[PDB]
Symmetry: C4
Subunit: 511 residues, 4 copies
């Protein structure tokens, strides 16, 4: 039975799970929800949200508490629980970097600054981030990761785990790079030929080749090479797809490297990370920018022909929920919300002050609607045929171009009937829509707090007819019909409110 795998060719991408494209509808537990005694506050929240994939930390300190003495008992417990609760897993390897720092490395690592040295600032101060240049730290992380991947292969032939995230938001706060002598000797050397080629530059030293950006590009390359070697060695044991996640710099008015985590896969060093990381399948943004223009711009920059869009983390405040459909609209591999458990922790002001059934309901709506047709939606994404949009404040109408024949008007905050006047939008921005092209004249359509009005895009389709507007669900790939919408229910577009409904709409023209 085929194991999970990431494919990408000519800018079309698929996460293949059980032999077909898959879309991650993800939930990530909080950072300290990775022990047997706390899982009873994880699963009741997942039951409410209904993700198809759960992200859980696997901490280096817990799997190798003493060097050479491995303990994967929590991985085993977690696989049983995920199988019982019918979710797939994405495991997060909290090791050399977690939010730039060594806090999840074991005692014998993070207390030993001699064997495992920290970044040194230009002024000579050690700071809370391990240097990518130390061979001992790479060796020890990679050895632990290799034991981890070997264990996974032995106990997960069911393929419950579909991806691995090596490290978590690697990079450095408080310095653009390491300035230790160890670092300076490498920085003074020649830029590796692989990076010279990919960057369209002439050979030379780091300062010669990259100028004012040499410090930041050097640090990104060195972190990338570090994680790539870990990815390559772990894949040699069990070749699950692997991705790294990015602490973002501001898309419009970024600060200086070091204010944001320098060296991480920020939007200015994506080609460096690509060159450095051939064994890393994608670079995934962690988006905690709730403002529409910022969020959607991050989506556009990380969705590249060489980079499948996966939103590995985003906020759990309700205004975030609507960003699922525009993410899927970039035809990547999915979207995950962060902080989904009942441990009473809150990452406000990034996310919600409390996680409960009310705060989860806007997310569960989208997860239920996509799950009603997940495999066809994922087939569409893998062919580049998924369209998605979310409501922007002060803009009550959007236009989606679908193909030569049809377009869709998206209108927010209107009745499900004729109305007089300009569309007002919803009082808060909460609407969204998602449209899959199955064939030129047939679409899968869902939305919430929104009207979707399909209309001709050319003179050939001016004589538009609703042939069928079928409500139903999919069982795997088999369509289960419930009813044909007609009359009032199609006279004013098709109108969605607060319940999950999937429509398979076949259009015709009269002749």
């Amino acid at each position: 039975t085929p194991m999970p795998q990431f494919v990408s060719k000519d800018g079309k991408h698929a996460l293949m799970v059980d032999g077909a494209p898959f879309l991650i509808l993800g939930a990530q537990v909080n950072n300290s929800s990775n022990y047997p005694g706390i899982m009873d506050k994880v699963w009741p929240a997942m039951q409410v949200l209904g993700p198809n994939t759960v992200q859980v930390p696997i901490a280096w300190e817990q799997v190798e508490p003493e060097e050479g003495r491995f303990d994967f008992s929590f991985v085993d417990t977690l696989l049983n629980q995920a199988r019982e609760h019918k979710v797939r897993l994405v495991l997060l390897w909290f090791a050399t970097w977690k939010n730039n720092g060594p806090q999840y490395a074991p005692h014998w690592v993070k207390t030993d600054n001699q064997r495992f040295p920290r970044v040194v600032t230009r002024e000579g101060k050690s700071i809370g981030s391990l240097s990518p240049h130390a061979q001992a730290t790479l060796d020890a992380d990679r050895k632990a990761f290799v034991a981890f991947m070997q264990h996974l292969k032995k106990v997960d032939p069911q393929h419950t785990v579909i991806m691995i995230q090596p490290e978590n938001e690697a990079g450095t706060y408080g310095s653009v790079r390491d300035f230790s002598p160890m670092a300076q000797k490498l920085f003074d050397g020649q830029v590796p030929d692989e990076l010279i080629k990919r960057m369209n530059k002439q050979p030379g030293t780091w300062a010669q080749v990259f100028g004012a950006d040499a410090d930041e590009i050097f640090h990104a390359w060195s972190i990338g090479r570090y994680i790539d070697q870990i990815a390559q060695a772990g894949k040699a044991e069990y070749p699950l797809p692997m991705y790294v996640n990015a602490a973002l710099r501001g898309p419009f008015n970024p600060g200086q490297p070091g204010q944001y985590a320098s060296g991480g896969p920020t939007d200015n060093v994506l080609d460096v990370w690509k060159a450095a990381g051939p064994h890393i399948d994608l670079l995934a943004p962690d988006i905690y920018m709730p403002e529409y223009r910022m969020y959607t711009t991050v989506l556009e920059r990380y969705a590249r022909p060489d980079n499948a869009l996966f939103v590995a983390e985003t906020g759990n405040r309700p205004e975030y929920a609507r960003y699922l459909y525009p993410t899927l609209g970039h035809n990547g591999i999915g979207w995950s919300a962060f902080g989904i458990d009942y441990t009473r922790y809150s990452n406000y002001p990034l996310g919600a002050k409390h996680v409960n059934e009310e705060t989860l309901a806007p997310f569960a709506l989208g997860f239920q609607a996509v799950s009603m047709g997940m495999r066809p939606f994922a087939k569409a994404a893998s062919e580049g045929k998924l369209h998605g949009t979310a409501e922007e404040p002060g803009q009550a109408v959007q236009e989606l171009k679908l193909n030569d024949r049809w377009s869709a008007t998206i209108t927010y905050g209107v009745p499900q009937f004729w109305f007089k006047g300009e569309p007002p939008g919803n009082p808060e921005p909460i609407g969204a829509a998602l449209i899959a092209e199955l064939s030129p004249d047939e679409f899968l359509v869902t939305g919430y707090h929104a009207r979707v009005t399909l209309h001709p895009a050319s003179d050939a389709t001016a004589n538009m007819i609703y042939d069928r507007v079928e409500e139903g669900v999919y069982e795997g790939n088999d369509w289960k019909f419930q009813r044909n919408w007609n009359g009032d229910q199609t006279d004013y577009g098709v109108n969605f409110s607060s319940v999950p409904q999937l429509l398979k709409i076949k259009l015709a023209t009269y002749k």
Copy 2:
């Protein structure tokens, strides 16, 4: 066992069901609630509202999806469900016209503008309404309707179905008539002698005879003849009563024909429709005019000596509920509310934003009260002896003339006791009353949010005595006594609030 039948003589009317007059307390599901997979969101709402009759679409596209290949399986399912849930059915034939358009005609009809042509505007544009002049469209609709009536006769000897509505709001938006050559050849001809007689006019062409109104009267006659031939052929197979429903034009400031649906049974062409439709039992208004003066004027215009009043549709917003009793007061055959299911569709702003137990309670109150004496109420209506009224904003008192001996004062928003000052009315208009004359000195009385004070109408009855004020219910026609109201409960009229109560009041005089 006698089948349902409509009788009318000298301006008195009855819908005979199971051998006696019947009054429809109706509920209509939304337009796309006509498939097996959605009926579990219909019946729980009917359980709350408690109609005695449910209206459900029977779509041409679903019973003849391919020409000649009939499928009445949903009709069969629906008859079983109506029998289990103890309601009668009125079936709506969604075919050549539904809200003026062909959207419920099958694929092989509504995509074939050659065989089944659309109305052509004066400027040459085909628009979304099938021409009444095409023989193929009439033939195909009638053939489907005949198969439908034949099936009904075979599977409904219980007579669950009591009426059929051929077509739904036939007429045309965007043109006063068809201007195609096919239409013009008929328009240029002589007005049929049947219409010339009924309209008190001299023979001639359509333009000669009817002048400025020729276009609209021609279209109404041609639609009427179309549906009448379908009614006649269907009745030849199974002679259930049949009615058509009207999309109204404004009673006071109507627009132009084509702004409102031209050719439908609007209030200016009722004699045309009568002349054209001898096999159509009545013309029924669909009233979505919530303002008192408009609603009640529509009632008066459609209640004619040659037209039994049936309100086939009205709004499901709570202010509409009170219009049941004035409708029954015209001594027709009943009243039905539109959009009664839990599918989460809303036709706001015509109706309510949500359908739930709260929004249905004002309707259920009236349906429960009338059902407590439905057969005697319907016997009264068939003798012209039913009186009914609803509260008008800014008018806290109304006077009902009952007969030579007695009248009833209706007072809104007062205590059930002595009060000082002018009656204030209810804060919102919600009151109503219904009074049946059983014999000169005995009345059935119910109401809500209202006081009913019977008082002498002549010097012969000045010495008024409450002989009996019996609360109870009817089992069929047998009166079941609960108690005699007296004392406080009759000193200030008889006072109704929010619970269904039927009173049988016998008056006397002391001597």
Copy 3:
């Protein structure tokens, strides 16, 4: 086993029930709650209120619907239900007068103005009140009442029924007396010697003897003689205690006789009614005057050495509940609230807009507290040893004189602890207290929303000691101890809130 009986000597009174004094904690159903089919809306309300005595109409129209054809089946049903629900009964004979009118007399009475004539005004108009002067009406009422009392004796040896109320608010609206010739012949005659004696006047005609008040005194005497003869004949069959109830005239600014019900036992003709009614045990006020000064003045006027105070009716709005204890403080026989059922009738503005568990809770509190010591409370009342008071708006302190040794300060709206400043009173007037003197130094004390502070009334008791402050209840006459209040619970008086608590307080002095 002794039957119920009213005793009164030297201004001390007792309703003896089962051989000992009894205090009525009464509830009266609404006027049309006197049929088997409505009793399921009576008993659930009594379960909440918990009266010890229920008042129910027994209508002449229902027990003699045709002359000579008696039907006491409802009396039988009602006795079974009262025994099952553990209440005593007071039966109300709705006959010649109910609120001045004949509406509860049978068909063959109230429609026959010839045999049973109405009062004639000075101008010659018959009005809605039967003349006390017609021998046929007296004969027919008395005959029905005699059949009623005979039936009671046969089917009620349990003595469920403890009193009878002949007629209901007898009197006349719209005329001071009857002016018919039948009436004038009697009015022109001599004042009966019995009334001449009791009124301390010299013999003469009605106009000579009574002057400007002759009309009103004549009507009161004639109604009184009418009901007295009915009482005497009914008592000859079964000598239950009997009382009449009064529709009050204003205590301070009364209107004219005829505006209020002339001839009823109003506060100006109590000596007339005493003289006329030796077989009527007491004259009971019906108090719907919610203002403190009016309510308590009515109490004082009807509590006479020759008249035991029984409040036969009062309002069911919550502000009325507190008037129970000052009524008991006049050492009569009890107090009853009117309109206690769930039939959805309201006599607002006299009483509450709705009867439910919230509106009944302030009454149930008092009924529960008195029931916790009802027989000792009733023994105290029969010895004149009960003291009671209710809160007056704007007066947060009252002083009750108990005996030579002790007094009680009643304070409203204070904490159950030390407080600074003037007592504020409760926000609405809701407090009350009730104190029985068991012996010179021992008292039964209860209250609600109030503090009771016992304190010395003389120099002999200056050295006051709380010997015992026992919370408990009585079983019949046997005291069941729960706890001794001390400390905080007695440092600031004894403080009552919203739960029923009976305290048996023994005082001492240190020496």
Copy 4:
């Protein structure tokens, strides 16, 4: 099995219960909740609050109602109930003084001012407080207390009762001392040599030695000697630890002795009470001063090297709950809240208007958190290693000095994440924290509505590492691990909200 015992040496103290230090998390029932018939309104409240120790009055009037006739049946019942409900008991001997007065002494005491004389004012008036100088009153109280201690020893080998409180707030209101001749003869004599030594003064009379404070110091010494002799005699029978409780005088602006209870253990006569009371283990404040500066100053004054801090009573209004942790921070023996039952009594304005699950929740939070590590917390207190603090209005940050190596910053009203700007504090003051030093680099930490940020206190610990931040609970002394907090949960201190959580935090430094 060792019985409870109080140990104190060189300013470190422990209440030894079952052989190890113990911390009282106490609840006291109201003053009249000391009878079998009211205990069903005590235990349901204790179930909600969850104290480990309940204080209950044992009244002299109830155990010796007649002289020589002892009745300890309630003590027996109460021991059974405390064992069933799993709490320890502290019994309060309500005898010669309760809130200065004799109200709980038996009838034959408090009514006999001859045998048991009251304090006489300077003007000759007897007032409500028994004189400490009468030998009969001492003899009779001591005899009753000796019978009580003998009974306890016989029926409590389980050691359910851990301390006894002889008398309750002894002292006098309305006079600084007794001025009777009996008192004056003693006052005129020489100051006992024991008091002369302890007060660092020269021999002489009371007026010579103490001057303006002679009256108050004389009264405190005489009350102290009275209770000490009772303590000594009771301990001779069963040597349970014993304490007296104090009605406080204002810490900053005290009134005159007699306005506050003169002679009680107020903050100016603590050395007198120590000298007079060698058999009294500690002097405990009763703190009903809700203002932060007053409450915490009282704590400081009563926590002395010769006086273990026990807060025997405090308010049950929610603002009081947070004072538990600063009390424990003085390394005494515990803290108890007053008025914890459902009898519907309120000592507002000292405490809450109602006791229910809402008003108890802020207290239950602290009791649950301390109970999760009660024995280690009590071991820490006995070594002087407990630190505790509560939030002060207008101060959102506090600093706790722990040892040479570490300190803790306490921040109130902040998110559990990074925030911009000055800490706002909670809207009402509700935060607190409690920190036990287990060893130099390991701490037990709990709090609520607060952030605790451990940080270096010296250059030696500048390179701080969170080695482990373990959430769990203790079973007795055995630690039960749940999870290791890391990541978000430790990046911004450790953050507590509204649920009980105990963290065992081991700190390291990197090298």
